[PDB]
Symmetry: C2
Subunit: 207 residues, 2 copies
C-alpha cells in the first residue's frame, strides 16, 4: 500500500530544507576569520548584539580580510538559543557598485523560453543565492518537491561567459538528509560576477 517511497522521502527532505527565509544582509563587517569560519557582525541591522557564523571549506576565508565589508546570503541550517545565525558560505565582497534569463524544459520539451524568474541586485553573488531563488521559483510554480507532483529528477545549468556550463542536481538529497547535509555543498562559497553570467537552463523530468 505504498509506491515510490524513497523519491517521495527525498523530495520531502528537500521541501523542508528550502522553504525558509534566508539570512540576507549587505555591507557587514567581518569581525574575525579562522581557518574555516567567517564571523560577521550584523548588530546594526538587528539593533542588538548579533552575528553570522558562516562555515566554509579550506582556504576560502584566505581571500578575505578582517574588517572588510561583505554581503551575506545564506540559508540557516540550524537554530539555537544564541543571537547567531549559522550558514555555509554565502559571503561576497561589497563592491563599489552594488538581467538573469534562462529556459526551462520538462521531459525534453521547452516550456519556458528566456524567462526572468528571479532577481539579484548584486554585481557579485553566490551560486547559493541563485540556486535558492531558482528552487523557490520551482517550488512555487511547479511544486517540484511536493510528494504528489510528477517531478522526480532535475538539473540547474549555469552558463558563464568564457567557461563551460556548470550543472547542479536539483534533487540532491537522501531520505535521511538534514538541512545541514543538503546545504553543506555551499561551503565552497562558489561565486559569480553578474557581468559574466550568460543564462541558465532548468531541466525537469517525470521519468
Amino acid at each position: 500500500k505504498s509506491d515510490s517511497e524513497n523519491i517521495k522521502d527525498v523530495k520531502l527532505q528537500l521541501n523542508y530544507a528550502y522553504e525558509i527565509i534566508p539570512v540576507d544582509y549587505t555591507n557587514c563587517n567581518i569581525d574575525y576569520l579562522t581557518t574555516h569560519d567567517f564571523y560577521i557582525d550584523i548588530s546594526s541591522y538587528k539593533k542588538k548584539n548579533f552575528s553570522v557564523d558562516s562555515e566554509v571549506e579550506s582556504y576560502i576565508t584566505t581571500k578575505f580580510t578582517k574588517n572588510q565589508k561583505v554581503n551575506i546570503f545564506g540559508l540557516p541550517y540550524i537554530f539555537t538559543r544564541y543571537d547567531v545565525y549559522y550558514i555555509y558560505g554565502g559571503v561576497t565582497p561589497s563592491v563599489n557598485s552594488n538581467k538573469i534569463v534562462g529556459n526551462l524544459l520538462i521531459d525534453g520539451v521547452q516550456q519556458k523560453t528566456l524567462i526572468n524568474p528571479i532577481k539579484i541586485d548584486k554585481p557579485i553573488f553566490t551560486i547559493q543565492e541563485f540556486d535558492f531563488k531558482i528552487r523557490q521559483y520551482l517550488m512555487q510554480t511547479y511544486k517540484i518537491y511536493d510528494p504528489n507532483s510528477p517531478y522526480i529528477k532535475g538539473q540547474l545549468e549555469i552558463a558563464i561567459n568564457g567557461n563551460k556550463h556548470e550543472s547542479f542536481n536539483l534533487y540532491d538529497a537522501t531520505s535521511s538528509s538534514t538541512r545541514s547535509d543538503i546545504f553543506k555543498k555551499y561551503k565552497d562559497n562558489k561565486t559569480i560576477n553578474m557581468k559574466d553570467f550568460s543564462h541558465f537552463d532548468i531541466y525537469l523530468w517525470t521519468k
Copy 2:
C-alpha cells in the same frame, strides 16, 4: 505494526513548521486596512518596494487605523514571487522605543511535577507583544532544550499557559497538528492576533506529558 507512529508524524510536522526565520520589523506604517488584512510597509528596511500582508480574523483591523505605526512579528506561511511577506496576525501597536528589557519567568512542569523555574529563556523587547511571538520563541527554546518535537523524546502532550493579571491564564496546545498539517494550517490560529501587555504579564507555565 506501531501504536505511537501518529504522535511521531505529528511531532515531525511541528518540528518542521517551527524551524523557521520569523518576519520581524518594528515601527512600520499601516498603508491600508481591509476587513481581514493589514498591508504594512517595510520598504525602508528592504530598500525597495516591499510589504507585509497580515491576514487576521474579523473585528481585528477595526482596532487599528491607516498610517498608524505597528511592529511585526509573524511566521510566514507561504512564499510567492512577489515582494510581500504573508503572515497571520503578528501586529501590535508601536508605542515607545520598543526596547523594553523586562524579565520573563516561567515554570516548567513534566508529568505534573515542577522541574525548574526558567529565567528569561526567551527575550521580548516590545512592551506590547503577540502570543504568536511568545509561542514561537518558547517552542524554539523547548525544541533546542527539551527536544519536545523529536520523535525519540517521551513528550507526546503539552500545554503552554500565559498568566496575566486578572486571573487570565491563556492556554495553548503545544502538539497542535496532524501528520498532514502544513505551516498555513498550523499558523492559522495566529489570525486572532492575541496580544499581551508586558506590564500585565505575570509568568508562564510549560506542561509536558509523557502519558
